[PDB]
Amino acid sequence: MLNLAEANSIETAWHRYEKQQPQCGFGSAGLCCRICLKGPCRIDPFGEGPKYGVCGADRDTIVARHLVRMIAAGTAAHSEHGRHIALAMQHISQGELHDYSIRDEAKLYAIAKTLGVATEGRGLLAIVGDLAAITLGDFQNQDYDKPCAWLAASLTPRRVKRLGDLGLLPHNIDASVAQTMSRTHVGCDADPTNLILGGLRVAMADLDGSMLATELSDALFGTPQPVVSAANLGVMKRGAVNIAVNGHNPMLSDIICDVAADLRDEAIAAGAAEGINIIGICCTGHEVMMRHGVPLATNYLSQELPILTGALEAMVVDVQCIMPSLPRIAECFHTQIITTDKHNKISGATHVPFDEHKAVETAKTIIRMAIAAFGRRDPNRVAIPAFKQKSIVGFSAEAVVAALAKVNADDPLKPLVDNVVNGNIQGIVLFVGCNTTKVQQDSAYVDLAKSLAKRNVLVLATGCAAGAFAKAGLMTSEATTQYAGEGLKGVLSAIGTAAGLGGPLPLVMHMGSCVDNSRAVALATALANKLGVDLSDLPLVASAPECMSEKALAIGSWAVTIGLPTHVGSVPPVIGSQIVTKLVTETAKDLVGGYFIVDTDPKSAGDKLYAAIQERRAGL
Amino acid sequence: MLNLAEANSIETAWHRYEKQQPQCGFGSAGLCCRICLKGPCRIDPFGEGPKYGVCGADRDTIVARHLVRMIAAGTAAHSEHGRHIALAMQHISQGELHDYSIRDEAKLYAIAKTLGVATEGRGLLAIVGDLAAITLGDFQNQDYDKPCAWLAASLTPRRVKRLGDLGLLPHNIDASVAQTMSRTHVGCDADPTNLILGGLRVAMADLDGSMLATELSDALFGTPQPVVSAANLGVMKRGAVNIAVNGHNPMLSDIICDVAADLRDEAIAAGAAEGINIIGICCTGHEVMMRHGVPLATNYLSQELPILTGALEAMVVDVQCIMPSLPRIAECFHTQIITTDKHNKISGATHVPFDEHKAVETAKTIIRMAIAAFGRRDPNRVAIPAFKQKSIVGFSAEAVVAALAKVNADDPLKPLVDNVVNGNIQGIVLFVGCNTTKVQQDSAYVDLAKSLAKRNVLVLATGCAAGAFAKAGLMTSEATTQYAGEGLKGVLSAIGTAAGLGGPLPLVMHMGSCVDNSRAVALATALANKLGVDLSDLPLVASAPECMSEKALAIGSWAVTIGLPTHVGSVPPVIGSQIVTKLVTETAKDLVGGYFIVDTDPKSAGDKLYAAIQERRAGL
Numbered sequence A, B: 001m002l003n004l005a006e007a008n009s010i011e012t013a014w015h016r017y018e019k020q021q022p023q024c025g026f027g028s029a030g031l032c033c034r035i036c037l038k039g040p041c042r043i044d045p046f047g048e049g050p051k052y053g054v055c056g057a058d059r060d061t062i063v064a065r066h067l068v069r070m071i072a073a074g075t076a077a078h079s080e081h082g083r084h085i086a087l088a089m090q091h092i093s094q095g096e097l098h099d100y101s102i103r104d105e106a107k108l109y110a111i112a113k114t115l116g117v118a119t120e121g122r123g124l125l126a127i128v129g130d131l132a133a134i135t136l137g138d139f140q141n142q143d144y145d146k147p148c149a150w151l152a153a154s155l156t157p158r159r160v161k162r163l164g165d166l167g168l169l170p171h172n173i174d175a176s177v178a179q180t181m182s183r184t185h186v187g188c189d190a191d192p193t194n195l196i197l198g199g200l201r202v203a204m205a206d207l208d209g210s211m212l213a214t215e216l217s218d219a220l221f222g223t224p225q226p227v228v229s230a231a232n233l234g235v236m237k238r239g240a241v242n243i244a245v246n247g248h249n250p251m252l253s254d255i256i257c258d259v260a261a262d263l264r265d266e267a268i269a270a271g272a273a274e275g276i277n278i279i280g281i282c283c284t285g286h287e288v289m290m291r292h293g294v295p296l297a298t299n300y301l302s303q304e305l306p307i308l309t310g311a312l313e314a315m316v317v318d319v320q321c322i323m324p325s326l327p328r329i330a331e332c333f334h335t336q337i338i339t340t341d342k343h344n345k346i347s348g349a350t351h352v353p354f355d356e357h358k359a360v361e362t363a364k365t366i367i368r369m370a371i372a373a374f375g376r377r378d379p380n381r382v383a384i385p386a387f388k389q390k391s392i393v394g395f396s397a398e399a400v401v402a403a404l405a406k407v408n409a410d411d412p413l414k415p416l417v418d419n420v421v422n423g424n425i426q427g428i429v430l431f432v433g434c435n436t437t438k439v440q441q442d443s444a445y446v447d448l449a450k451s452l453a454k455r456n457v458l459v460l461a462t463g464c465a466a467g468a469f470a471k472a473g474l475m476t477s478e479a480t481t482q483y484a485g486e487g488l489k490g491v492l493s494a495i496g497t498a499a500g501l502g503g504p505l506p507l508v509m510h511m512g513s514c515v516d517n518s519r520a521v522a523l524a525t526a527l528a529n530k531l532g533v534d535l536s537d538l539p540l541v542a543s544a545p546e547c548m549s550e551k552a553l554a555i556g557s558w559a560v561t562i563g564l565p566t567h568v569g570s571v572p573p574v575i576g577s578q579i580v581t582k583l584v585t586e587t588a589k590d591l592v593g594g595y596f597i598v599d600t601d602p603k604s605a606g607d608k609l610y611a612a613i614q615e616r617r618a619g620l
């Protein structure tokens, strides 16, 4: 926890959770079913109740069909973000979408290198078209046996073989989601094993979306490089127009950032002495935190609380992980919750649609409204907590290897590799996932982080996990000296002073939004290649102690298919099926290297994670 | 009904249904969300308790989001069928796939006239090459404002403009299923009106898949023409090896049927003096019956009873509506449940994969596995009820027009309209639907047809609904002379005796499988184009007295969006929201012209349907 801005008149996410107590144990068990209108069909595993549904389907085919349908939804969620980015890149290539451009042409040529596109003497718009045509191809191929272009280009070669031999390499992101929906229909795919393999194949179609999203978003806006930022509710200035950007797509926020600069004088004119101060919520808040250093107000669960300070002039949303309660809560104040997307309206908000073509003028309209919301701000109701915590963020996979080249420009990975074979770094944990109410907010992350840090493992974080470490200052050079542990701290401070920081590198390491989890794969696959090996051999581990979204389920599943022991700290609906639970814990260990780790205890989970790393080290 | 193989000590669909009593009711009203792993949050409508989910979404977001995902899983189910035909038509245009070919070169040409393929002096394979490309574009177009190819080309140009101006013409089948699962992810679309409107678009994609599948499948296997067949379990033979074909895809069955004939001389040699008995279950059987007249054993709920006869040697199952209990109901006997699709495997059943490049060869293998099970049939455990109801089927839209051309070959549609303005044909009804255990099998189907036919309205049917009418004897000439009203019986008898068949046209005309519901919208659009109107003005109505599947919910949802008053007889999860209910029942009569009629009383349904039929006659 952290802030505690007591409503005392208003329902919040914590209130609505307790009024749901107790929650249906059937659904939490995975023994609920509503796929056809002959249900609802439940399974009584014990006292001689119904052991089958009207379908004839058992507990295992019921639990599994819902597992992969959840993975499929999270894949559809991530892929819709990457599709907008690739559709842009196709418009940038055709002299259209003028408000956008290739702001990082260095990242663009490197993307075309990993994809095989010629760049020598070709001109920018030709490469961009070759890059958009390929990336759109992953959304339209019908040859079930042709892997996704980004997957084949971006994994280790050993992994590409392992999955293609099992048919786990997707051919089409849209078709993977749709073929998962169709096969889980009433009376279609039954076999729990065929089902779970079908969820792992569509989990890879999520990885594709996350890769092409991160890479082409860099080329659109710039690769993150280390920057100083600040987190928590304190970053709201009373003397400023406070604009919260919540959602996922930086195509809106990165434009709002630039327009917020030229529009400062209108903020001062309306009576805001400190201009307009835009703040970030959730993954779009991380995108502009990663890139431009814009502060991060809060992560997921505490996203209604900015309106509670009585000084949020407008919260601009687009898609995903935004709470439908926000038009209700903002009606008690002056706040303007502004929806933007064609496929993301909240009843009671204010919709201004984002014409990507007319981008910077739609921004002005948005900021003009929030300047006018400042006009109706009640001044004796402002109550901003003074919690602002600083954090060094912007640690893209590119920048991390750059700071290593301040230690060895010849072999930039050699310090990392050498410091692993000797034990200063026992391993790497990547903290992923959102916020759940069945885990005390931010506590499981911080418990796990310092426990594993102390054990000499490097911590990387993304999304609402990096947001939970951002606040509570584990993203500081000081957090490294206090909790790292000697061997881990010795290296962390070496690179930390090689690149001009001021101390060591922060304990945890921001890599960005959930799609930017593809950065750590790029980090790890290059490592796995330097050693001439695969990720199912590296002392590498993922952990989602507080996960909820279907994205978190899809993200975690391809973390298994890639080779990582993946810790889940919020129990998916599998416990009702011992057979499915065997499939993802055992069996996965053998087929695909990675495996799941379901533990609700942050202390005992970090014991299995270190054990997984220590077992992983032994294999070398 | 009528058969019911009351078998002792074996569990069936009805036995498994009654084990589930009572079923949740929260899920029946749609007041259980189940998306985000912080739930399952449920809504209490009356006595205090929880009024929201933890994300903050009200009952109307929870209800709308689940309905819209059922529409998407139903579109994915049908679209995957259509994509198989389209890929086959592409291997066909290139010289791959030597077992399949353009059997109805005629159909191929009329499919190309409309939809705009140029034919003038062009080889057949160039014409079917353009057809394969255009149709595959409906699965890969990324221009959001580019309507689907078939949709624009196939339904009335007035409805093209309406749905276009409402934004309901889909641009891509695969991306409509995906953008649906994404926008219904946690924290995404929440406005009830927006969600159900987006579900109306992913429903118009099920019309696309159904359209291309039906039309293209005809060119590959032949456009159905009137054929006499037989229905019910009495279609099995003890002196023949009985092979059942369940599922949906005709690409398998049509082969199996042809190969069975060439493999008759090996059957008799093994002891099957009557050869290969290929019986049909669900839609695969409907496809081959409509085209070749093969017998249909049963529909959905009674697909396990053919095993109880002790005379089923194999059940070759491909995709969709295949009960997972069948492998368990075998073993008890000698039957071989044989799965074929890589995305449709059932634990305990024998899987031999179906390569379409090696269709006939695979076919022979399957059939041989059954002629081996014939030599394992316990002859002391045979029990074929001997219910063989003769059925006249094969009534494609083309066949209907031809019969109306045997009376007026200059204005073939004039006999229809004239008899609708005078009153002899008060209207038409399309009976779609499956089979649910909450309504006695086939009961409401039969009752609703007779009550309406007496009121002088033509009865058309598809799928398991048509199977119910076939096994009941409403698909014969005598049924018209008995239950049809005077005016209707007159027109039917005239066209009949004028188009051979020596009698009146069947009371219920078999229009085909689920995808063949596009034949009814074809006939309707043609009549509406002869009268200068839209389907929203024709006295046309759809009814699903025993729906249960997601495909049916989608099949009914595009019927509403094309302008048809649709009746549902199983109550979708919608009662929990009066807003969503009103949106799909009342405000749809203002936006898209069609609407839903939830009743569940078969008597009150027909009264309301006839009221709508007569209301459409007020106009015109």
Ligand code: SF4
Binding pocket: A024, A025, A026, A027, A028, A032, A033, A034, A040, A042, B024, B025, B026, B027, B028, B032, B033, B034, B040, B042
């Ligand atoms: S539908 Fe299933 S998860 Fe929802 S309350 Fe009922 S038993 Fe529980």
Ligand code: SF4
Binding pocket: A033, A034, A035, A036, A037, A038, A039, A040, A041, A053, A054, A055, A056, A057, A062, A185, A186, A187
């Ligand atoms: S799909 Fe089968 S197990 Fe699921 S609700 Fe329907 S009848 Fe029950």
Ligand code: SF4
Binding pocket: B033, B034, B035, B036, B037, B038, B039, B040, B041, B052, B053, B054, B055, B056, B057, B062, B185, B186, B187
């Ligand atoms: S999206 Fe909201 S209502 Fe639905 S399960 Fe999650 S928290 Fe509950």
